[PDB]
């Protein structure tokens, strides 16, 4: 009984939020 | 000049009825919020300044105060969900969308960045940004014959903001908006700047983390050959999301998985399965495990590319998480494979490292190994070589570990262990 198993822990990723320092 | 004011001075300046005093104070605020060590976002919110900044966003006659307020609000919206919420509650979203058409490139870029910070808060603010109409003007900023005429920082910021519009789930982004965005996204996936490529691959991986219909709308755009190409890159920031996207796509149907195999992806996995970065190894093994869960001709493609010895390798020596994914790949292989294929698995050396892993404490990995052992014996009974395999397992110390597992806290573990011993070793 083989099964495709989606990603364990999906959320090196881009920052969700970014401070603008200059 | 405007360096190092107090919130008190900034307030008096904003509350004067002098546009130029207001501009000075807004720049002072921006400079407080652009310092490194813990900007006083909460002090600025508490002083009531967000509504004023938001009103300054609409002063077409004074583009500098538009810029300074846009930057200040960008930096407030980059904080906690409560601070981003304070910016949204001030009416900022429609005002930033209006600014996206500014004739001043730095004001437009600042608006792009602020909307990216707001959408990066989560699904609700992402969908609210979309409902106010941001996608149309964002995509119009990129509607040029050759992306290479745009300034590099500008294009990187636009790409990051788009990637955040494609991000998060529960719910996933609206399907109409995904179809609006995808063409521009594929174009950016063919750009030559590494940061644009990394963020585009991230967006694609976000969109493929869903049900097979999202996967399908992405695969129908023909991005898989380009994803395989990027899977080959040398920059880890590009390989990592390219591998994530390929893995997501192969969690889908057998025909989507086949689109990945036909683009050449398997030829890359000898490197990926021996990659010095643990995360690459783990993600590549998880991908392999979802491919060995496919059809028999797909398993045969895995065999033909020579990847079984690489699986034996990761199973023999690797970070334990990578080894657990390799166990899953072996179990899916022995579940779906022909007898010749399972025989081949054994001739490559799977049994000894599989047995060595039964000394582990994780219960599900042990369960998975026992399922794989069952499947292998059951291939052997089809050939009558079951005695040879029983001996082989006894000889590397596996049967000792199985016997010990007969008396395990888990029920199905003890059940499978005792079944194995009383059915093949008696």
TrEMBL record, chain A:
Basic and acidic residues bias locations: 12-21
UniProt-recorded name of the protein: VP1 capsid
Lineage top rank: taxon: Viruses
Compartments (UniProt record): Virion
Sequence similarity: Belongs to the parvoviridae capsid protein family.
């Amino acid at each position: 009984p083989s099964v495709k198993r989606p990603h364990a822990s999906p959320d090196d990723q881009p920052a969700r939020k970014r401070l603008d320092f200059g | 000049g405007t360096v190092n004011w107090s919130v008190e001075d900034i307030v008096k300046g904003i509350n004067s009825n002098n546009l130029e005093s207001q501009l000075q104070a807004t720049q002072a605020a921006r400079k407080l919020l652009s310092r490194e060590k813990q900007p006083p976002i909460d002090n600025i919110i508490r002083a009531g300044l967000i509504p004023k900044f938001v009103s300054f966003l609409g002063k077409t006659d004074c583009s500098p105060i538009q810029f300074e307020s846009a930057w200040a609000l960008t930096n407030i919206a980059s904080g906690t969900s409560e601070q981003t919420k304070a910016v949204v509650d001030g009416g900022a979203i429609p005002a930033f969308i209006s600014l996206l058409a500014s004739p001043h490139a730095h004001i437009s870029e600042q608006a792009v960045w602020a909307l990216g910070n707001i959408a990066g808060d989560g699904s609700a603010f992402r969908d609210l940004v979309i409902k106010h109409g941001a996608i149309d003007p964002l995509l119009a900023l990129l509607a040029v014959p050759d992306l290479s005429t745009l300034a590099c920082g500008y294009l990187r910021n636009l790409t990051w903001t788009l990637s955040n519009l494609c991000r998060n789930k529960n719910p996933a982004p609206p399907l109409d908006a995904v179809e609006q965005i995808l063409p521009t996204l594929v174009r950016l996936l063919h750009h030559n700047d590494p940061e644009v490529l990394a963020d585009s691959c991230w967006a694609i991986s976000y969109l493929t983390d869903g049900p097979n219909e999202r996967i399908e709308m992405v695969v129908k755009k023909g991005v898989v050959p380009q994803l395989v190409k990027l899977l080959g890159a040398t920059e880890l920031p590009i390989v990592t999301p390219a591998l994530r996207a390929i893995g997501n796509i192969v969690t889908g149907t057998d025909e989507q998985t086949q689109k990945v195999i036909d683009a050449g992806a398997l030829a890359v996995f000898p490197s990926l399965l021996t990659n010095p970065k643990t995360n690459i190894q783990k993600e590549a093994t998880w991908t392999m495990s979802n491919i060995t869960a496919g059809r028999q001709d797909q398993i045969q493609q895995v065999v033909n590319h020579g990847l079984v010895p690489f699986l034996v390798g990761v199973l023999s020596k690797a970070d334990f998480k990578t080894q657990k994914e390799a166990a899953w790949a072996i179990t899916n292989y022995t579940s779906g494979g022909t007898v010749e294929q399972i025989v081949y698995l054994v001739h490559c050396g799977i049994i000894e490292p599989l047995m060595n892993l039964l000394s582990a404490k994780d219960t599900k990995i042990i369960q998975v190994i026992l399922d794989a052992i069952s499947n292998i014996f059951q291939a052997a009974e089809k050939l009558g070589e079951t005695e040879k395999l029983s001996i082989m397992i006894e000889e590397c110390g596996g049967l000792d570990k199985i016997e010990a597992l007969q008396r395990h806290e888990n029920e199905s573990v003890y059940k499978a262990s005792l079944n194995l011993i009383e059915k093949y070793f008696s």
